[PDB]
Amino acid sequence: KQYIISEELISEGKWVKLEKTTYMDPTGKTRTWESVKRTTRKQTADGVAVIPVLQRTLHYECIVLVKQFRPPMGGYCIEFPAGLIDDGETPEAAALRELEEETGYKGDIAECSPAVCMDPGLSNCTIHIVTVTINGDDAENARPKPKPGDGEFVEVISLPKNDLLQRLDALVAEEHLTVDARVYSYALALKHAN
Amino acid sequence: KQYIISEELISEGKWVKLEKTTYMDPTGKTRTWESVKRTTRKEQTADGVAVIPVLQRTLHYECIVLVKQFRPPMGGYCIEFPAGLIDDGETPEAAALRELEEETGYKGDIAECSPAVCMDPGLSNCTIHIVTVTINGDDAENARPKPKPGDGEFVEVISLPKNDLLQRLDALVAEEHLTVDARVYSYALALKHA
Ligand SMILES: C[C@@H]1CN(C(=O)c2cnsn2)[C@@H](C)CO1
Ligand SMILES: C[C@@H]1CN(C(=O)c2cnsn2)[C@@H](C)CO1
Ligand SMILES: [Cl-]
Ligand SMILES: [Mg+2]
Ligand SMILES: [Mg+2]
Ligand SMILES: [Mg+2]
Ligand SMILES: [Mg+2]
């Protein structure tokens, strides 16, 4: 019933553009929207985010997260390891590579989502959410060696999965960070389950 | 270590702006970024709210109340938590309850309210509070709930069993062209992984 009539460029950067979208509402009245797109998609999705479950025997299972300065936020954020998918890269392979780049951990694919939207009221940005286990007793994950690309500055934070939401709250209390909304949503449902 | 040096407007629309961000990297070298921001944010602790509405009904499995809408940035239909921007002066909790009623018809009760969390921190400064709300499905007010959608809002309600959330989302995605939001997917994944 609803659909795009046309898109008008308002401004294009190197990395992102701002558009004016004309669309037909379900009454048959034409209406406008301001929409953000990345310039980089060429792919299933712009990005992957990795849910990394670090499993060591005799330890709590942890979820591995990253802390980075995010310039749009003017501050530090806690997030799932993530990055954009390279043209020709599959989302699984992007996940494995981003996890290793950002955390040094070498993981196995558990499962992969379809493309899901990041902020659909503002942007067309999508990601694949890729659940990955990390055999933390394996020698290759003993001294995880992070291989950052140029400009990445990434602290690794592993938190127990059984207390994730309280631990994220506690960090926000002392550290003055912003937790990512997908991270917080996952942490909430861990508490809300059963 | 890292901090914002300057924020230069590139293009300001009615609803969204693009900025050139200049910041200090942690090697002591100046760098830049393209940042998206809303023009709507005032003294709000966040741009918006998203509601996690748990419909509770005696001798029913608990359901998660979702909405399906056309999202002009995405050029298609998206399944999301009920959500909206916080009006000036409105509390996150008030905005969550109002948006939940407007979009679904249900009158909830506040359970919990997150700190401000980032929507897509590599791209924008947008934040929300994620507010968990219970709905007493056995109350007469929530019996045959009528949405009060605002001007240009067209929202369908989709209630899905919490105990089967992720498979139910996959079955909707299998049926038609429609995207599931990353926060909803993340929440449904965690329900599985617990
Ligand atoms: C159409 C207006 C603007 N708006 C947006 O969310 C928006 C539009 N383009 S970007 N963000 C809501 C406040 C609804 O009323
Ligand atoms: C500065 C570059 C571009 N980029 C972004 O994510 C980006 C930056 N501003 S908006 N999107 C990464 C691919 C690597 O760093
Ligand atoms: Cl798992
Ligand atoms: Mg990343
Ligand atoms: Mg990366
Ligand atoms: Mg809404
Ligand atoms: Mg609304």
From Swiss-Prot, chain B:
Impact when changing L85A: Reduces affinity for substrate about 6-fold
Cofactor requirement: Mg(2+)
Binding positions for Mg(2+) 1 per the UniProt entry: A83, E103
A cellular-component GO term for this protein: cytosol
Keywords on record: Acetylation, Hydrolase, Isopeptide bond, Magnesium, Metal-binding, Nucleus, Phosphoprotein, RNA-binding, Transferase, Ubl conjugation
UniProt modification remark: Phosphorylation at Thr-32 is required for homodimer stability; dephosphorylation results in destabilization of the homodimer. Dephosphorylation at Thr-32 promotes the ATP-synthesis activity.
GO function term, MF aspect, one: identical protein binding
Binding site for Mg(2+) 2: E99
Glycyl lysine isopeptide (Lys-Gly) (interchain with G-Cter in SUMO2) crosslink site(s): K29
Residue ranges annotated as motif Nudix box: 84-105
Residues bearing the modification Phosphothreonine: T32
Keyword rRNA-binding: no
EC number: 3.6.1.13, 3.6.1.58, 2.7.7.96
Residues annotated for Mg(2+) 3 binding in this entry: E99, E103, E153
Induction entry: Overexpressed in cancer patients with a poor outcome.
Reactions catalysed according to its record: D-ribose 5-phosphate + ATP + H(+) = ADP-D-ribose + diphosphate; ADP-D-ribose + H2O = D-ribose 5-phosphate + AMP + 2 H(+); 8-oxo-dGDP + H2O = 8-oxo-dGMP + phosphate + H(+)
Cellular compartment(s): Nucleus
Effect of W15A: Reduces affinity for substrate about 8-fold. Strongly reduced catalytic activity and strongly reduced affinity for substrate
GO biological process per UniProt: ATP generation from poly-ADP-D-ribose; chromatin remodeling; D-ribose catabolic process; nucleobase-containing small molecule metabolic process; nucleoside phosphate metabolic process; nucleotide metabolic process; ribonucleoside diphosphate catabolic process; ribose phosphate metabolic process
Pfam families in UniProt: NUDIX
Domain of life assignment: Eukaryota
Function: Enzyme that can either act as an ADP-sugar pyrophosphatase in absence of diphosphate or catalyze the synthesis of ATP in presence of diphosphate. In absence of diphosphate, hydrolyzes with similar activities various modified nucleoside diphosphates such as ADP-ribose, ADP-mannose, ADP-glucose, 8-oxo-GDP and 8-oxo-dGDP. Can also hydrolyze other nucleotide sugars with low activity. In presence of diphosphate, mediates the synthesis of ATP in the nucleus by catalyzing the conversion of ADP-ribose to ATP and ribose 5-phosphate. Nuclear ATP synthesis takes place when dephosphorylated at Thr-32.
Protein family: Belongs to the Nudix hydrolase family.
Description of how the protein assembles with itself and partners: Homodimer. Interacts with PARG.
Protein's UniProt name: ADP-sugar pyrophosphatase
Source organism of this protein record: Homo sapiens (Human)
Gene symbol of the encoding locus: NUDT5
